[PDB]
Amino acid sequence: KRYEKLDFLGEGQFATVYKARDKNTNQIVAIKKIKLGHRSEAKDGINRTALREIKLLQELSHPNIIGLLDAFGHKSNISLVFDFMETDLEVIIKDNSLVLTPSHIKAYMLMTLQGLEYLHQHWILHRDLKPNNLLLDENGVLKLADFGLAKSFGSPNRAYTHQVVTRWYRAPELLFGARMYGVGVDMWAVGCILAELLLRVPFLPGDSDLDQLTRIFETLGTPTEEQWPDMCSLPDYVTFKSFPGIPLHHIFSAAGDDLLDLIQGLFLFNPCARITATQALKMKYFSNRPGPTPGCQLPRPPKKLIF
Amino acid sequence: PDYHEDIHTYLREMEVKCKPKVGYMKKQPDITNSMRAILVDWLVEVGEEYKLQNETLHLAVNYIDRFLSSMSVLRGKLQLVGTAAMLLASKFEEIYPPEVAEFVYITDDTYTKKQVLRMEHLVLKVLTFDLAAPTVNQFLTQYFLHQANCKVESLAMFLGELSLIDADPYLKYLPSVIAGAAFHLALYTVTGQSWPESLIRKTGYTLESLKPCLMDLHQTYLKAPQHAQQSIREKYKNSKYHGVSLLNPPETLN
Amino acid sequence: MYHNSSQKRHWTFSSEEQLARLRADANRKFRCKAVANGDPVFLEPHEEMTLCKYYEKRLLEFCSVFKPAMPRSVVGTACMYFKRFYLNNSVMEYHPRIIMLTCAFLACKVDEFNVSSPQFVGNLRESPLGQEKALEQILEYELLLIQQLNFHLIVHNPYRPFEGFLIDLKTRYPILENPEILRKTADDFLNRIALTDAYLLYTPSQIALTAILSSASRAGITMESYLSESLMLKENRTCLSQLLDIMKSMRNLVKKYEPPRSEEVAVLKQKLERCHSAE
Amino acid sequence: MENFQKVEKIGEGTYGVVYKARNKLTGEVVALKKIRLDTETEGVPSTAIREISLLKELNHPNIVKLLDVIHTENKLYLVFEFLHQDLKKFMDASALTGIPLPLIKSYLFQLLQGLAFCHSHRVLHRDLKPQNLLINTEGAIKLADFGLARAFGVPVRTYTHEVVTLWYRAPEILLGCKYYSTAVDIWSLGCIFAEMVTRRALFPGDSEIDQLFRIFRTLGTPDEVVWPGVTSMPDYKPSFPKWARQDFSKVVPPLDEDGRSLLSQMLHYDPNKRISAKAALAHPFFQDVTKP
Amino acid sequence: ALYEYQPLQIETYGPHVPELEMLGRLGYLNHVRAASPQDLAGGYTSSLACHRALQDAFSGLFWQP
């Protein structure tokens, strides 16, 4: 007598997501039921991704980060209760009915960057930033979600499993096999999400890691040792052809000068020199006219044979 | 491949078990052969629109023919049968099938998505999950290794697809026989050679055995411009298929 | 970070009186349940505390010789889990041995110390049949243990604050020529702190600073200037007074700790074994 | 569908849930894969459709038996023969001691027989990993998890998302090839054979580039002599490091000359030159195979 | 409505921690392990580790339950 399953939201390899009501305040919540997996993991205990999500979300509280309302579990199967999110950024990006005015893009970027700044102040990397991991509510508040890949950074000698985001939003340092990284991996994914918002299509849609690196170097130029001092030292580094790269304002013709500067800063090949969330929020682009859209005003998503 | 012979033999084993009941067409009280041809032409149009492989089209045609050999379907639901069979063939053959939304949008929403879903379930139940059926495309691919002329292969594919449109002469021939006849007809049309001896020793089909289906296919090729259904000819006029549908068919075939 | 952690908001208590109240409350609840089910077999709260101390020492020994070598954070997390669990529960309901094994398992999973289940159970000094039985028991008790922690799995240990304080001393305190000689003794003091209930009463930074200052006092070195000037506590004397008061309370807590007696542990273990078969 | 009594839940995967059940009317322990056809916006899943369709025609002693298929309005039940544990668990429990060589040879012989039956029936498994090979108590091993299986009567194109786990992935897939072939299954089976022999993965890579580099390190960087056409592969970069092939004695120590020769035939760079399943069945390695 | 940046104000209940970019200028980095070129390639600097250690050392030091 705690949760009344009223819908099926989605299905995935790690878990099944459905819709429920709290029966106390009749609140609408999204319950993620964690699967048992393969029989070979039946002696492993509770799923490690579920434990990671629980432990990380029980220590964070920001408006732009998904909240873990409850973590009740049957001893056979554990379930995680989140706020119900109406949609995500990917649906809005792929929806041609609605138009992404500059204020919409600025507001989405601002919510993402504020959530990321809160996340990075607590020494946590999201590591799975993509448009469908930026969920939206009926009030138009963007929240980072899917913390199964998230981990805490800052402490040295903590290299661990090689869990990385999908290659389209993977930073070049990760594509070269870097074990030790900082906020730059989230910053590159934020730049890729901004490029997707400006183009309505994936910026660098490679079909493999090598092709992803090829596209990155073809679009932004193969970096030298001036712009990336220790590029060759990464364990999975390979040499590439010296592509001149496309000038930024050709790719983004409608972008302004401040937006071009922000995009350049987010796509710097040097992870140390890449602009952080705090640096990006202090940029002139966000303080320029027009202002970001208020969350309430953000957009919400042949022949018959005659026989 | 050293298993290749086995595969061919295995194909010859299952083309018998996946053949539609001959003469099922007159046991249908509502639908006739002309509207079956119209349905196959519409399926060709759909395959062009969604850029599906020819194997998907052949599999869908086979599924439709097997379904109609055991169930009576009204003239209103024949197109739904075609859509569900095409969706099943896309699920079985394509890398990723189009969502059902596109399979109902192509029919200008004649049937809702739920109808497509239910008829797909019924087709699966009748076919008893026997969806890996040998087609003319597969046998033609098997035969093409004994050549290689791009135009010959394209025209053999064109004639094999033409064999799907008409059910009166072609339902009594197995996919292997039709593929052999089409390969001979393409070899005659382009390069002037005949049914290769290697193929006779491989498949056991001599010239006399192929002769009936061969003459039927020759007549079909001759009357292709006058045929009411022309989507295959428009499909093969593109430079992708090397423009062999607009070729000049032989007037005599010895 | 600790300052907005679940450990600070829910698992640091104002006094040892609250801890004693909670443990006696758990004992009373178990006694009421057992008598409602259907007298000298029940253990008093002090006997439960003695058994808890003995089994925490056993958990420390188990983690000390674990293969592969556990990071110290994992051992601290397991000990904190044991303390938190038996704060609100009775050892007469869940056996302390299996609960300590479950705490070690959960600490390994939470701290990203990737070890498989056969590895963990192979670290047991038991027959393979016993290893499988203990594995099944641990798997059964894992989610109950996660319940009794209120799903608060992140545990903040004093080791990183200790390292940060050492860095700050090496940088901004030239008076102390080399803080490195303060390490070992402070480490020893930290272990003594781990034996008491200070982890449930004070912050990790306070514990690490207390260890550092105790080690300095043992060596005849005083850093009143470090607290008054480097930490800028000369502007607010009240906070400095509370800080020294906290440190002196921690030192008294360490001094008053009494390790269990072997024969008393044997008698209490026999009583627990008898009681774990009478429910 | 009242004929089965659910005993327990074996496990749950991407789209279905597997129960261990008892046949009430006969007493046979079976596995029931329940796939809820409701909550599906596309119908019966393409993976389930392909799996059932291909598994109905694969009646082999070394392939999991699909006893029955139950189709219901909004769910689908698949009845499989029940096997107690898989190969992955078997070597996880046989660690520190090692699966015996006769058992290794028998298991490899049965796997190759099952794969030869699959390929002679124009079925491409594409998902050969130890977690997908189920053993029983009498010493049999059977191929399972035909979720990635495809029929290659026409060429099968490579798709990025549907692909085997990285450790058993062929280098042609890792260099961006366009069409699958029966060589990738042989590559995975050879990797599994080496893993059984050495109790660890042959190429435990973490990324695509890392997997390719481990392959290149163990077998030598490919030039056009060993793999004609490699330099024109879509993802082949000329500046790939030129590692040198190390002799197989330190790659698989316990294996003898026959086993090493067979394994090197299963690990040919060129998919065309890689040994086929039945040609592997006709190798001197299996002159003395007795199911133990 | 234009946007004006405001820094996050989270109370740490302890001594003020120096800014990340000023750690080298204040001599903190001389007592931490130097970042390897491999670490620097990925964006990991010893400054991050030093800042995290200092923040952990000063977190909650003045707090009483």
Ligand SMILES: Nc1ncnc2c1ncn2[C@@H]1O[C@H](COP(=O)(O)OP(=O)(O)NP(=O)(O)O)[C@@H](O)[C@H]1O
């Ligand atoms: N907080 C939420 N509120 C509502 N729906 C949610 C929420 N979180 C997830 N979902 C839904 O759950 C579905 C499952 O998707 P996801 O959680 O990404 O699984 P996945 O496919 O394994 N992940 P990925 O492989 O990274 O795309 C999504 O499609 C969402 O629609």
Ligand SMILES: Nc1ncnc2c1ncn2[C@@H]1O[C@H](COP(=O)(O)OP(=O)(O)NP(=O)(O)O)[C@@H](O)[C@H]1O
């Ligand atoms: N016939 C069988 N006998 C015993 N166990 C079985 C059988 N069939 C399936 N299983 C078990 O059922 C579990 C899940 O099956 P399945 O639905 O195929 O998941 P999977 O393919 O292993 N996982 P994924 O690829 O991640 O979706 C596995 O772990 C197998 O151990």
Ligand SMILES: [Mg+2]
């Ligand atoms: Mg997601």
Ligand SMILES: [Mg+2]
């Ligand atoms: Mg599977």
